[PDB]
Structure formats: C-alpha cells, structure tokens
Design an enzyme around this catalytic site. Structure first.
Site, mmCIF file in Angstrom:
data_model
loop_
_atom_site.group_PDB
_atom_site.id
_atom_site.type_symbol
_atom_site.label_atom_id
_atom_site.label_comp_id
_atom_site.label_asym_id
_atom_site.label_seq_id
_atom_site.Cartn_x
_atom_site.Cartn_y
_atom_site.Cartn_z
ATOM 1 N N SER B 150 0.924 -1.278 -0.009
ATOM 2 C CA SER B 150 0.000 0.304 0.375
ATOM 3 C C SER B 150 0.692 1.463 0.066
ATOM 4 O O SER B 150 1.193 1.960 1.195
ATOM 5 C CB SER B 150 -1.081 0.095 0.699
ATOM 6 O OG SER B 150 -2.559 -0.583 0.528
ATOM 7 N N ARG B 165 6.483 6.307 -5.300
ATOM 8 C CA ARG B 165 7.284 7.014 -4.412
ATOM 9 C C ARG B 165 6.628 6.516 -3.317
ATOM 10 O O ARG B 165 5.984 5.540 -3.129
ATOM 11 C CB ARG B 165 6.662 8.485 -4.171
ATOM 12 C CG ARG B 165 4.456 8.395 -4.328
ATOM 13 C CD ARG B 165 4.703 9.998 -3.224
ATOM 14 N NE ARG B 165 2.934 9.696 -3.172
ATOM 15 C CZ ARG B 165 2.507 10.093 -1.898
ATOM 16 N NH1 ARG B 165 3.929 11.211 -0.773
ATOM 17 N NH2 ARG B 165 1.133 10.185 -1.134
ATOM 18 N N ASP B 203 -5.520 -2.845 -0.312
ATOM 19 C CA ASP B 203 -6.216 -3.235 0.618
ATOM 20 C C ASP B 203 -7.223 -2.592 0.006
ATOM 21 O O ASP B 203 -8.185 -3.482 0.990
ATOM 22 C CB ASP B 203 -5.150 -2.466 1.724
ATOM 23 C CG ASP B 203 -5.519 -0.931 2.301
ATOM 24 O OD1 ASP B 203 -5.125 -0.610 1.796
ATOM 25 O OD2 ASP B 203 -6.430 -1.033 2.989
HETATM 26 O O1 LIG Z 1 -6.137 4.475 6.579
HETATM 27 C C1 LIG Z 1 -5.740 3.970 5.221
HETATM 28 C C2 LIG Z 1 -6.869 3.945 4.452
HETATM 29 O O2 LIG Z 1 -6.135 5.414 3.459
HETATM 30 C C3 LIG Z 1 -6.151 5.434 1.650
HETATM 31 O O3 LIG Z 1 -5.429 6.836 1.741
HETATM 32 C C4 LIG Z 1 -5.224 4.756 1.435
HETATM 33 O O4 LIG Z 1 -4.911 5.062 0.048
HETATM 34 C C5 LIG Z 1 -6.366 3.125 1.519
HETATM 35 O O5 LIG Z 1 -6.187 1.843 1.018
HETATM 36 C C6 LIG Z 1 -5.981 3.347 3.244
HETATM 37 O O6 LIG Z 1 -6.711 1.036 3.424
#
Ligand SMILES: OC[C@H]1O[C@@H](O)[C@H](O)[C@@H](O)[C@@H]1O
Ligand SMILES: OC[C@H]1O[C@@H](O)[C@H](O)[C@@H](O)[C@@H]1O
Lengths: 479, 478
Positions: B150, B165, B203
């Site tokens: 992620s 990045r 995720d």
């Molecule tokens: O808590 C973080 C969540 O917020 C977003 O900015 C991310 O891209 C999600 O995939 C993530 O689970």
C-alpha cells in the site's frame, strides 16, 4: 470480524520443554470428576453457611424477600458508592421488564477517603441534591426511595440498615465502623431538605441478581467475575436455619430470600480446591494468608501472577529465557490480567503479539518455542479459573434444583477475558454432560447481567418501599 | 452499553445556547447539500475514469471477475506495512468460507533506509520460514501469492507494480520507478520457495473482493479510518482511459475493480461544506489543498476541528474564562479519542468529558461548557459520517445499485461511537427510505472481511485461474 484462533502446532517444540508443558497441563487441568467433587463440597458449605452454626461462607441474607415480577413501575434512585467515584442513578421502571435511566457520576475527592464521617456523607448528599434539583426542579410528590450500594463488609438485621464492619480500599474514616451508615446518609439528605428516603442498603451482586431478574425472568443467579468474585441467588426462608426464631410472621417459611454468598472464602482449608505450589506461594505472600481461597483461584487479579511464578520456576530450573535479563519477572504483580489476555488474543502462529509484550513491557527476548509455552500456560490458567468459577454456579443450581438457568454475569473477567464465555460454557457442559451442540442452547448458561449497583439498587428500593409503605417486614423482629 | 444520556439544555445560559445553535448551523449537512455533493462526486468519478483524468485517480485494479464463493485452494497473502509484514495462508472452502494461518514479523529498523536487496530478501526470508513450517514436504502447485503493497504504484497488469514514491518514511534506493513484483520474485527464487507472486493490490481492493467472496451482496469496499478509500466494480466500457489498450478477452462488458483513492475528491474546494476551522486544518497541514475529502471524513481530524472551535470560543470570551488553556494550543493534541470519549459519555453531568479535560488538558470545565462540548463532538462525528456516505451514494448511484452491502473497515467505522447509526441515518436521509430498522435499509454498511490478507489471497486465486487459462490480467502486450 475477530480473527480465528491460531492453529498452535506444538510439532517444533523441543522435548525438554514439551515435557514441562505436559507437566503444567496435568497440574492445571481440572477434570469433570474433580469439578463435580468440588461442587459437592461447595454445596455442603453453602448449606453450612446458612445454618445456625454457620461456616466459612458468609451466606448473608440480603433482605429482598420477593422476586421482581417485571410489572413494577415508578421512579427510584440508586446511589453507588465506589472507592474513587459515586454514581447517582434515576430509574423509571416501565412495568414490562423494562426501564429508563438518567445518571450522573462524581469523582470522590482524594481527601474523603481519609477524612471525617460528616464530610463523606455531606459530599454524597450534595451530589444527590444537585442530581434531584436538575431532574425534579418543581420538587417532588412523594420522596424518592433510594437504594444504596455500599460494597464494604456490613451486617444488616434489616434492609434499610447497614452496620459497617470494616472499611476497605484505602478508606480510613474514623467513627463509622460499628455504626449504621444509613442514618448517617439520611441525616445529611435531611439537612439539605432533599426529598429522598434511603430505603435499602445492598451489596452490588445482590443488585446484579435482582436487576437481571427484573429484565430476564430466567435469571436464577447474579455473578461477579472480576478483581473479586461473588454470587447471589434466591434461597427460601425455611432453608436458612440461622434466621429461625428471628423472623416476624409476615416473613414466612416459604418466603424467598436473596443471599449474598460472599463465596470468595469457599475452601480456605483447601480440601477440594486444586492448589499448586504456585497458588501456595501466592497465598503465603498475600496480605491475608489462608483467606479468600476461592477468590484466589478464580479472580482475574491472580492470573498473570500465576504465570509469573511459573515462568520464574522454569527460568530457575534452567528451562527458558536462558541468558535473558529476567530481573523484571521478579517483581510481584508486574504481570496483571492483561498479560494472559493479550497472550490468549494473539492470532499469530509465531505469536508476535506475545513477542512484543515480553520484549517491550518486561525486556525479555523470547524464542518462538518459548512463546508457544507461554501461550499454552495462559490458556491453562484462563481455563482453570473459568472451570473453578462455574463450580460455584453449578453448586447453587444443584442446591436449589435449577435444571435450567440464566446466570447473569458481570465483572472484568467475564466481560473482557479472551474466550472466557466459551471456557465457562464448556466447563458447565463438562460438569453436566449435556448432549447439546451449541453454547446458546445450554440448559444452564452465563449471560451479560444488568447494572447491579445502579439499576438493581433502584429495583430493590422499589421492592422495599412497597413493603415499608404497607408495614411488611424487611428484617428481623423488632429492628 | 448504557443508553444515550438525556442531554437536557435547560440550564445552559442564553449566550452559550446561541453559540451552540451557531455550531449547529455551521456543522449540519442537510440532505439537499449531501445530494448536491453526490451529483458532483459522480461527475468526478466519471472524470477520473476518462482519458483526461481528474483529481480522483480511479485506478483500475485488474480484478476483472467477481468471486462466486465457489473458489477452493490454498493461497498466500503478503501484507507489507511500515513497521510490520503479515504473511497469511488462506484456504478457501468453496462455500463462501475460508480458513487462515498467519504470522506477523517486525521489520528490522534498518530496512527503511537499507538497500533494495535488503528489503526483498528479508521479506522472502519471512516467506520461506512460513512456508517451511506450514508445508513440511512442499506441495505440488506453487502457492499463488497476492501482495498488498500500500504505497503509490502503477500497474499495467495485476501481476506487476511500479513504485511511484515511497511513503511512511521509507527511503530505499533502487526501487522508485521499477516493477517490485520481479524484485520480490527473484528473492523468493533465490531461496527456492514454492511461491508465485500473481497479484499486487491496494488493501481497499482486497476489502471489496474478500467481502464479496463471503457476502454475495457486497457492492463496495470502504475504509474509514486515519485515511479514507473506496473500491467497487465498474464496467470496462465506462473506463475511457482504457480504450485501445485492452485485449478482446477483457471486453466492453467486463467487470473491473476500481481503487478510487477518492481522498482527493474536491481538492479545488468547491462543494464540501468547509468551515473556517477546516480551512485552518488544510492551511496548517503538510499538504495544503490536498486530500480535501479525506480531511473532511477521516477520524484523524475530528479532535482537531474541536480544538479549533474551542479555541475560537475561548478567544471570543465564551468558555474557559480564567482557565489555563496552554495545552489546548498544541495542534493535534486532541486525537480521535476526544470526540469519541465525549460522545460515549453516558452521564448527564458529562463526567467522562470532565475527567478527560482536567486530566489531559488541565482544563476545568463547567457542566454547561461540557454540554456545548458534547454537542460539538456530536455535530462533528455526524458531519463526518454524512460526508462519507456521499461517496457511498455516488458509487451506488453511478452503477444503479438500489440495494447494496457496503463492506466497511477502518478505525472510525469500527470504533467511533454510534458511527454505524449515523451512517445509516445519513443514507436514509439521502434516499428518503420508508424503513424503521437499520437492518432493513436497502443500502447499508456491514463489517468487511480482511482486505490486505484474505482479500489479497482471493485475488491471487482469481488471478492464477486466468493465468493458468491464458486469460488477460492487464493491457495488451503486458
Ligand atoms: O487508513 C489508510 C487508508 O486510506 C487511504 O488513503 C489508502 O489508500 C487506503 O487504501 C487505506 O487503507
Ligand atoms: O470484584 C468485586 C466483587 O467481589 C466481592 O469481593 C464483592 O463483595 C462483590 O460484591 C464485588 O462485586
């Protein structure tokens, strides 16, 4: 979605340690046969406690002499006095096993725990006045009946009296032990012309029984499984030989009578309780050696301490933590209940939650195989505690002949100890040998209780007030 | 839980009541405004899928099938976090059911600033030592692995991921600009482990897929936590940025999981009902003008909004007169547990709220002050819920979903007090449904399955099937 239990393969654990786990299993296992024998003794001691001679188990009459029917209606107060806080609660009974609460909480100023009697009771009264003034700004038709949860050892010859025998939990207020606290609180209420009548003084387990029975007609027991332990159930006056000769005519042989067991003292002689050398050490090192034996085997408070002493024993016999700095493991009560809780909650095969816990709180680097032992141990000690606790449930059900029952439970262990409900239900199923597949279908089962010290005290105040208004007794003759 | 406190305002003086009503005005989001928001939101979702694109990334997830619940087999998931990795073995039982076995490993602290080989070899090592355990004499098939990575990453196909990045303070030379999948795969190979990396996911995509596998009514996966995200299945013919790039076996009608990344919705600051407090939050944040929708719906900011309102009320003479409010001046001193503990307070005298302010902020409050503060915490939790469901409504409306389970995860949905009730009422206000129990709402949030583990593994299952068959999982040629 909470995670599935980890698989917890023991395949990779060294023989030398696997022998030690096996040693601890045999030591901490409570068999169905051992439970049923404990229960048999427990029943004799519940009866002994009620007899003219008495016993180790107090079996204290609670002076609640009817079952709530769920039809009761009206506005009742409760005061719950803790060591750090008191709660004032207004309960409106809806008369269909239902209720509404309006409540405040007040932090007890540190001063009061060691100050004067008048200061304690004026602070309580001032809270009551602030509460009543807000919720009843027009004043009040009839005074409000109040039930007072005063969970400190007190004797009662009647429900609207409570003679303090001994302050606990850092309270050191002069001039109160040996005296009835009900008039003390009542006169401060009066000094402030607050429309309240203190009609009942109770222990919170008694409140737990009664409040849960009001909302749940299958309730046959109230239980607390937390830092301390207690149970309350209804017996029948004819079965309380120590009240013979003391009762007025309108409390007859077939009258119900709520008993506050205070069964934490069951088996101080350790005839049946399965004491290991670890329980021995915990007993000899405690404030009160030889006392509170059943409390010491079932309370949440000792579960991490048991683990500690076990781990130290394995360190000293050269089994684990070899070449670790374990000088933190040497401090009594450094491992509280959150240790076996966190260990049992660990969903990882490599037990990384446990790894972190032992590294960060106790500076001990564990191998994976040492963690598997720690987790096995946590399970055994959680499990034995639940199994011993339901020996109390089972004794009370058997004594009274309840083939089915809801056991209304509360306290930090029932509410928060991992898998505690599963453990307790399995223990009952083992005792009774029920041919039942799911815990929701157990003839006898623990269920979440109602609020014993607020709602229960107010329902007791309802039950009591109705008797006081009719001139029916709530205590022995003459009191 | 105890019931909700009664919450009488009868004793609050007129001057304070007026300010409470002022906060109400400011922080209430009407149905109508939610609707105006939902119309622009749909516009921005369509925009992100267009050739030109938009502020919302709307990233194709290269999951081009729904799980049927009939899937069976053993699959791995790898979930790389900033501090820890999780390795999950997932056994699908082919009746919407699964079993897991999982390990978690702390990343040695040097990995943040170590080499590329350093990171991938440690991961592979964790894998090897996991697989060596759960498979004593190997298995015939290599285990397909789904990797939840992620970090911003472009994919022309599911079994690839080019790092854009690093975030979460990672600083590894040799990775930005390259496909990380072959990097992990050659370390796996260099340890001779029976594993095939077939999928790299975000995720939220996994939250969607895993929940749909167990719950056939799942139409969206949503994270409401410190960050916010949503994922759902669009239709390939609705993805104009993909025209000319797709092989025939991913035709016009094909489902396509979209990772929205919709935190960036309304970065222009045009439609979200910001207040002067939100403006301050944005201006003082690390990224002013970025992640506007996230700043209005994440739990990270709920206590900060409150701090700023209370400060403004102190500065303006209304509250904490002759209190020491120094601690109140620290930005982010009130994390999400403040409005949470405050909303949870069951007492008419708001004693939980009293103890929180005295102990953590050394501010002694009056009951009436606490009543303000409680109403403020409510307004603020309630606004965040209503804005969140605008994104839910936007997706549902775009796709013609009249009925949906919205599979939700994240710290706000899981732990913020009455959040479910607030979302459910928001949804009910938007659609004007004639229902009386939340369990019967046509559109509703439900607890999600594990996206980053179970979901990554199910996605591997579905991907390995297409790969075994010769079916495309990305653009032509890739
Ligand atoms: O808590 C973080 C969540 O917020 C977003 O900015 C991310 O891209 C999600 O995939 C993530 O689970
Ligand atoms: O944890 C405390 C519990 O245990 C006993 O020692 C008390 O008398 C109970 O009434 C109490 O609720």
């Amino acid at each position: 979605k909470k995670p599935p239990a980890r698989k917890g393969s023991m395949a990779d654990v060294p023989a030398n340690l696997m022998e030690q786990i096996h040693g601890l299993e045999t030591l901490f296992t409570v068999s169905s046969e051992k439970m049923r024998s404990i229960v048999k003794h427990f029943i004799s001691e519940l009866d002994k406690g009620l007899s003219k001679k008495g016993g180790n188990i107090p079996m204290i009459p609670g002076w609640v002499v009817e079952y709530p029917t769920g039809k009761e209606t009206g506005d009742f107060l409760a005061l719950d006095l803790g060591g750090t806080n008191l709660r004032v609660v207004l309960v409106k009974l809806g008369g269909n096993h239902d209720f509404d609460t309006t409540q405040n909480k007040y932090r007890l100023p540190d001063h009061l725990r060691t100050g004067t009697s008048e200061q304690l009771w004026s602070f309580i009264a001032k809270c009551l006045k602030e509460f009543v003034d807000e919720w009843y700004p027009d004043g009040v038709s009839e005074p409000l009946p109040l039930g007072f949860t005063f969970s400190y050892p007190a004797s009662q010859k009647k429900i609207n009296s409570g003679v303090l025998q001994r302050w606990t939990k850092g309270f050191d207020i002069e001039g109160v032990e040996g005296h009835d606290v009900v008039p003390m609180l009542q006169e401060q209420i009066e000094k402030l012309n607050i429309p309240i009548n203190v009609v009942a003084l109770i222990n919170d387990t008694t409140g737990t029984l009664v409040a849960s029975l009001y909302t749940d007609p299958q309730t046959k027991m109230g239980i607390i499984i937390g830092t301390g332990v207690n149970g309350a159930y209804y017996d029948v006056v004819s079965g309380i030989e120590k009240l013979e000769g003391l009762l007025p005519e309108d409390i007859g042989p077939d009258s119900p009578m709520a008993i506050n067991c205070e069964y934490g003292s069951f088996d101080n002689e350790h005839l049946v309780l399965p004491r290991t050398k670890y329980d021995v050490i915990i007993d000899e090192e405690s404030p009160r050696p030889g006392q509170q034996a059943f409390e010491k085997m079932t309370s949440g408070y000792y579960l991490g301490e048991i683990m500690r002493l076990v781990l130290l024993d394995l360190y000293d016999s050269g089994f684990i933590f070899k070449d670790q700095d374990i000088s933190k493991l040497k401090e009594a009560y450094v491992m509280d209940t959150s240790y076996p809780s966190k260990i049992e909650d660990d969903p990882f095969e490599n037990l990384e939650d446990t790894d972190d816990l032992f590294k960060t709180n106790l500076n001990i680097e564990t191998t994976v195989v040492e963690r598997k032992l720690i987790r096995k141990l946590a399970e055994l000690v959680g499990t034995r505690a639940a199994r011993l606790t339901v020996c109390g449930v089972s004794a009370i059900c058997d004594k009274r002949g309840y083939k089915t029952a809801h056991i209304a439970a509360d306290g930090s262990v029932f509410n928060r100890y991992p898998g505690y409900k599963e453990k307790a239900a399995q223990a009952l199923k083992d005792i009774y040998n029920w041919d039942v597949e799911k815990m929701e279908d157990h003839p006898i089962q623990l269920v979440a209780a109602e609020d014993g010290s607020g709602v229960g005290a107010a329902i007791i105040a309802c039950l009591t007030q109705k008797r006081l208004a009719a001139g029916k007794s709530v205590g022995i003759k003459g009191e």
